[PDB]
Each structure stands twice: as C-alpha cells, then as structure tokens.
C-alpha cells in the first residue's frame, strides 16, 4: 500500500475526468472526493 494508494487516487481522478465528459457532476464530485480523502489518508 501507499505506492498503490498513490496510484488509486490517479485512478479515481481519471474516472472523475472521464465522468465530466458527460457532464455527470454526481460521479465527479464523488470520485474527486474519494480520491482527496485518500490523499489525506497518505
């Protein structure tokens, strides 16, 4: 972990980006969050 946690944030922040490509704010505001919380979990 960590080396992966740092890798999963990116995984999240990507999905989030991919989500805004359909204006899906819901998913976005969530993944961009599950990600941030985790960067604090670091």
């Amino acid at each position: 972990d960590r080396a992966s946690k740092i890798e999963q944030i990116q995984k999240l922040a990507k999905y989030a980006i991919s989500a805004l490509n359909y204006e899906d704010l819901p998913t976005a505001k969530d993944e961009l969050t599950k990600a941030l919380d985790l960067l604090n979990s670091i």
């Binding site: 990507k14 999905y15 991919s18 989500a19 490509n21 359909y22 899906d24 819901p26 998913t27 969530d30």
Partner: protein
C-alpha cells in the same frame, strides 16, 4: 464582406453533408448565429473538428456501457447503469464544443 448568419447557416450544412447526424434545421440556425463574423474556411474548419469527436469520446473515455445487434458498447460516465470499465451520435452539442476550441 463575410457570410451573414444566413450564408453561415448553409456553410455548416454543406460541410456536414451526408455525415450521419440529426441536427435539425433549428440547430443550424443557431450555429449560424454563434458564428457572427466567421469566414468560410473558419466555419469549415470548425465542422472538421466536430466529428472526429464521436471518435475522441471512445478514445479517451475508458468505461463503456451496453445499449444493445447483439451487444453495442459505447463511452459512458460510469454512473450510468452498467458501466463496464474497458478501453455515439453527433448531437448539436458536438458542434458547440469545437466553437470554443478554435
């Protein structure tokens, strides 16, 4: 003098031509006004950029949903029922994007 929302309307038509889409006339009237002061090459470039879009959507978006004929997966948010993580139509919204990006 350059095209006048009237001449710009037809210009969008012409460049789209047969390309499978569904922008009703209404939609063209709009893109004709969005382009006040644009030129033929301009409007023409514009339309070349749109299109190549349905393709970009499937190139960047890694998450496809099934809307199936047997099966037909396409780019989707992932909060759309069935999102299958794995690496569409030309709405007026597509010509909209390439208006800013040029």
């Amino acid at each position: 003098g350059s095209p006048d929302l009237a001449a710009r309307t037809t210009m969008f038509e012409i460049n789209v031509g047969d390309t499978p889409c569904v922008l009703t006339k209404e939609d063209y009237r709009t893109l004709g006004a969005m382009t006040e002061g644009y030129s033929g090459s301009d409007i023409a470039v514009v339309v070349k950029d749109a299109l190549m879009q349905p393709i970009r959507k499937i190139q960047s978006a890694t998450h496809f949903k099934d809307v199936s004929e047997t099966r037909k997966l396409t780019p989707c948010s992932p909060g759309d029922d069935g999102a299958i993580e794995m690496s569409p139509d030309l709405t007026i919204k597509d010509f909209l994007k390439a208006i800013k990006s040029t």
